[PDB]
Design a protein around this ligand. Structure first.
Ligand SMILES: Cc1cc2nc3c(=O)[nH]c(=O)nc-3n(C[C@H](O)[C@H](O)[C@H](O)COP(=O)(O)O)c2cc1C
Length: 433
């Protein structure tokens, strides 16, 4: 009955609300300060958030006007630092807050990734999640010196095998009680319980064994974000949590239902997939207070930064278009006009008092079948602070949000006490014996 809430973040300056770094209250320039991250983690745990959800890119937004220069000037996801580096400090200052890290299957080898995720699963005591992504920004393929550039759908096939490899390492290589720490017999780990995985496929050849001992979750909680038909299929097959695009009930409900249907052919119980929507919240004690914040942020909204983001995200360079050309069924003039507005993004914008925000959140949950939200920021830390001070108590009083954390791993916070490892109906469960 309780709504899962994640804080949506990225280790860079301009993430989603382009132009806002200028706002006098903002702290985006602190992205280089370790203290920003630990203070954030502490704030989010105070607000009982499920997790900090970190986006990432290793590509550059160089589509709009055929150059990275707009992205560079407007700080559109450049500079960007590595999100995995943040985790240990944030985990150190928190007890329950979990961490979902975006990391691409397209560039770096799974054997190194598997050890990194196992390491965080140990260090965080089972509070790590992985947002599995394929990446769509061409400068990454150039900079990792990829010889054969993979097509959109083929990137997801590579991701399938990438996950196959990680699942074998995480679930199958070392048996549950491999580590015995037996001083009498001088056996730290029973060598008969550590196994090669002997993986052999189209993209990878990985004899194994894994380098790490079994950690609390073994496999990190698996997120997916990617709305293409291939992406939704990938979600249905692998994801425990799905970050969906869409800003209304009809759209979100369609996608929730679509993914749950797709999951059946893989033998998955669709209730074993949680559905997350994006939401931007601008809240005040009174409507006028909310509107005052809205009007302030609107002043700083940078159309040019958004054009750069749109270019990288869609592949469409709009500078190359007459006002009067057509991309969907929308003129290019109308695409651009929607983009200079705060609610033009593919997330719900909720503006008003806490009763209203909560009402609108509750509506999406109850009518679209969504399980949680990734909270998108307009200002740091103001959006999160206002959400925590004003919306959280309203949600709590209504039974819609935890008053305090459940114990256990992040998977248990999501799926129930005792569900610390992937359920029997997940495909990774195949590799246990
Ligand atoms: C809600 C949402 C969030 C996303 N977050 C990221 C991200 O943080 N990093 C990234 O490279 N792609 C992100 N993407 C895009 C995809 O994860 C992926 O990179 C791919 O290029 C697009 O997938 P699709 O074509 O299957 O939709 C996101 C997509 C959606 C819908």
């Amino acid at each position: 009955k309780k709504i899962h809430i994640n804080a949506f973040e990225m280790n860079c300056v301009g993430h989603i609300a382009h132009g806002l770094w200028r706002h006098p209250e903002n702290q985006r320039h602190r992205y280089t300060d370790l203290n920003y991250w630990t203070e954030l983690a502490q704030l989010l745990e105070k607000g009982k958030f499920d997790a900090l959800f970190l986006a990432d890119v290793v590509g550059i937004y160089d589509v709009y006007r055929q150059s990275r220069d707009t992205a560079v000037r407007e700080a559109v996801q450049i500079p960007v630092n590595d999100p995995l580096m943040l985790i240990s400090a944030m985990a150190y200052v928190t007890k329950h807050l979990a961490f979902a890290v975006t990391f691409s299957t397209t560039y770096e080898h799974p054997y190194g990734h598997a050890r990194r995720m196992s390491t965080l699963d140990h260090l965080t005591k089972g509070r790590i999640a992985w947002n599995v992504v394929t990446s769509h920004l061409p400068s990454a393929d150039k900079n990792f010196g990829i010889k054969k550039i993979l097509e959109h759908d083929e990137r997801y096939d590579l991701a399938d095998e990438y996950l196959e490899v990680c699942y074998k390492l995480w679930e199958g290589s070392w048996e549950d009680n491999a580590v015995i720490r037996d001083i009498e017999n001088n056996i730290y780990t029973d060598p008969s319980k550590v196994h090669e995985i002997n993986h052999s496929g189209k993209y990878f050849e990985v004899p194994g064994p894994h380098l790490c001992e079994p950690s609390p979750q073994r496999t990190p909680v698996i997120y997916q974000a990617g709305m293409s038909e291939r992406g939704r299929e990938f979600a249905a097959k692998h994801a425990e949590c799905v970050f969906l695009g869409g800003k209304d009930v009809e759209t979100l409900k369609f996608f929730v239902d679509d993914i749950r249907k797709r999951a059946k052919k893989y033998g998955r119980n669709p209730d074993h997939i949680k559905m997350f929507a994006g939401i931007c919240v601008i809240v005040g004690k009174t409507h006028d207070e909310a509107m005052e914040k809205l009007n302030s942020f609107q002043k700083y909204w940078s159309l040019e930064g958004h054009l750069a983001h749109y270019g990288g995200g869609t592949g469409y360079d709009l500078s190359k278009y007459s006002s009067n050309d057509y991309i969907g069924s929308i003129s290019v003039g109308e695409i651009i006009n929607n983009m200079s507005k705060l609610d033009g993004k593919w997330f719900k914008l909720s503006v008003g008092t806490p009763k209203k925000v909560a009402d609108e959140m509750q509506y999406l949950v109850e009518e679209a079948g969504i399980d949680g939200f990734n909270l998108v920021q307009y200002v740091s830390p103001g959006t999160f602070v206002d959400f925590i001070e004003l919306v959280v108590p309203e949600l709590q009083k209504r039974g819609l949000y935890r008053v305090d954390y459940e114990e256990g791993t992040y998977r248990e916070k999501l799926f129930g006490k005792g569900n610390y490892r992937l359920p029997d109906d997940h495909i990774a469960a195949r590799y246990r014996n």
